[PDB]
């Protein structure tokens, strides 16, 4: 009957938790059993590690029915640690019929070491305009961020970003912002 | 008798003041006449414009005598506008026998619009260790800086630099910090 699916692919699941198995979140339009007691599920979710800058989710609307998604909130609650999370898709759109990857980005600013709390509130609506699936109410997620330290430092008022690349200002280029 | 020379080449002078003629600063080890009444010379020096990110000076120790230079202070007095000025040579060294270019950089941070005061205190010493030439005492120079505005903006907590290039953090690349 139901056709919506949302999962984390086996390869992405391995980098995140160590087990190379698909993590099912929604199957045939129904939330996975582990999600029903959300507070218990959240306490088993560790803070996203420093080596992970983004996460891949896979979704599909596998039948003939059309479904629409909308990202209602993409918000960091610790703006000095991490900027707002991002998605590589438009904020409102159609859930694709062919299985496709949505990349959620976690932009640590590289100014502070710490854990940033953030929100990803998304809804799925059917063609009657009713919300059929959504991020559990008041859900909070966590990301571990590190202070950036570039090899050899950044000159000319430049700053190191979390990819260990120098952020060079006006008329300055190269690995350490020396060139013109 | 004297052999030291310091000048601004005709091409650099044209971009700065509009006249394509070498500007002589030191000739045969003697400060140019316009420099004697330094306060009067300073009031004829306008703030370095926004389109100029660095300036080229040319120097030479044209004889057999050896001379040593030292940059004693490279300091911005308006750190929120412009970072410390820079030079593309070691802070202490030999004045070259072959005429060579020293590039002085003015790193506007791109966070504020305004004029930054700065210092470039340099000395030249002979082989007896005595200072024979130096930046006039208490000299202040000025640089016009602009707030950076990147076309299409910088995403994922990225910031625009004064070269109109996005300063992207961890695991984010491209013109607007979208890629992974
Ligand atoms: C692109 C969508 C992003 C929607 C997602 C919103 C959140 C995006 C922000 C990042 C969230 C991830 C942070 C934590 C990372 C992590 O450590 O995940 C590992 C956990 C552990 O999962 P596990 O250990 O495999 O156990 C569950 C599965 N078993 C094996 C029990 C069957 O696995 C998880 O707990 C997965 C966490 C995600 C659960 C959030 C529920 C979202 C439901 C949204 C419903 C509306 C959309 C429907 C679409 C058809
Ligand atoms: C790499 C050295 C940097 C040493 C330099 C230190 C300063 C570096 C910071 C930036 C300074 C430039 C900021 C102002 C830019 C500007 O508007 O310059 C234009 C002026 C106008 O010059 P003008 O209009 O041609 O008039 C003078 C020449 N006439 C034609 C009269 C003969 O031309 C000028 O006024 C030139 C300004 C520079 C004068 C500073 C004196 C420095 C003497 C140092 C002596 C020690 C070193 C001896 C070396 C052998
Ligand atoms: C995430 O998906 C993108 C899309 O192809 C892929 O290039 C990237 O390697 C994936 N990352 C992980 C950890 O699977
Ligand atoms: C400054 O000198 C460098 C050294 O070659 C040169 O590449 C640059 O074009 C010069 N800039 C100006 C304005 O003359
Ligand atoms: Na730096
Ligand atoms: Na930005």
From the 3D coordinates, which CATH architecture of the largest domain in chain A would you assign?
Answer: Sandwich
Strand order of the largest sheet of chain A: 3-2-1-4-8-6
Oligomerization status of the protein chains? homodimer
Summing up helix and strand content along with how strands pair, one would put the structural category of chain A as: mainly beta
Secondary structure tally, helices of chain A: 2
The CATH superfamily of the largest domain in chain A is Wnt, WIF domain
Hetero groups in this structure are:
1,2-diacyl-SN-glycero-3-phoshocholine, 2-acetamido-2-deoxy-beta-D-glucopyranose, sodium ion
Distance between the termini of chain A: 63 Å
Q: Describe the main β-sheet of chain A briefly.
A: 6 strands, antiparallel
What is the succession of H and E elements of chain A?
EHEEHEEEEEEEEEE
How much beta of chain A, percentage-wise? 35-45%
Q: Rg of chain A from C-alpha positions?
A: 19 Å
Could you tell me the CATH topology label of the largest domain in chain A: Immunoglobulin-like
Tally of discrete structural domains of chain A:
2
The level of helicity of chain A is under 10%
Biggest interchain interface, per-side counts: A-B, 33 and 33 residues
Number of strands of chain A: 13
Overall outline of chain A: elongated
Function (chains A, B): Binds to WNT proteins and inhibits their activities. May be involved in mesoderm segmentation.
Domain EGF-like (chains A, B): 146-178
Protein name (chains A, B): Wnt inhibitory factor 1
Disulfide bonds (chains A, B): 108-145, 150-160, 154-166, 168-177
């Amino acid at each position: 009957t139901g056709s919506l699916y949302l999962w984390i692919d086996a390869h992405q699941a391995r980098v995140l938790i160590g087990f190379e198995e698909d993590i099912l979140i929604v199957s045939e339009g129904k939330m996975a059993p582990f999600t029903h007691d959300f507070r218990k599920a959240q306490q088993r979710m560790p803070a996203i590690p420093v080596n992970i800058h983004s996460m891949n989710f896979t979704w599909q609307a596998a039948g003939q029915a059309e479904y629409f998604y909308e990202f209602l909130s993409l918000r960091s609650l610790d703006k000095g640690i991490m900027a707002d999370p991002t998605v590589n898709v438009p904020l409102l759109g159609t859930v694709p019929h062919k299985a496709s990857v949505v990349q959620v980005g976690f932009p640590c600013l590289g100014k502070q070491d710490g854990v940033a709390a953030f929100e990803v509130d998304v809804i799925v609506m059917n063609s009657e305009g009713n919300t059929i699936l959504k991020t559990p109410q008041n859900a909070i997620f966590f990301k571990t961020c590190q202070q950036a330290e570039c090899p050899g430092g950044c000159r000319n008022g430049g700053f190191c970003n979390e990819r260990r690349i120098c952020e060079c200002p006006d008329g300055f280029h190269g690995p350490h912002c020396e060139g013109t």
